[PDB]
Design a protein around this ligand. Sequence first.
Ligand SMILES: [Pb+2]
Ligand SMILES: [Pb+2]
Lengths: 87, 80
Amino acid sequence: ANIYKGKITRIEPSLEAAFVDYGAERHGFLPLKEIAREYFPANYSAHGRPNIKDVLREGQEVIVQIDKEERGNKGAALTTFISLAGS
Amino acid sequence: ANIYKGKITRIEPSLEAAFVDYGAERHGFLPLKEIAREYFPAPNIKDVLREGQEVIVQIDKEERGNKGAALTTFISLAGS
Ligand SMILES: [Pb+2]
Ligand SMILES: [Pb+2]
């Protein structure tokens, strides 16, 4: 089973990424490129990327799956692009 | 603690609903009204879903009596 509701805990604009509590002791890491457009509050330009602080808010929940398992001191690499048979 | 990837096991036109194996022994019940438009075809349940396809669901009512959980694809997400 590889799906979770992740709560955004700390947003890092200079990394274009956020930390996510997905129910494990150690928070995962969610890069902007792994955030599906349904989470974006507005339609951006075809060029460039928004500030992640204009995409996500602390306390918001997103649906995530683990892309890279937790390893050593690193949190899991997460994505909101969910694998579904027949989608 | 309340989100699952479910596989459609059976489609029942007479109930306008599908049954979903989301990891419990009792299949969950997913009526057409609880299916988001992201699952709809490019209408009746038979046109929308097919056996083997996966959906993201949450439980809206737990198992009770002899019934599976009542499921939805309209996932509850804080802040959004
Ligand atoms: Pb990716
Ligand atoms: Pb252009």
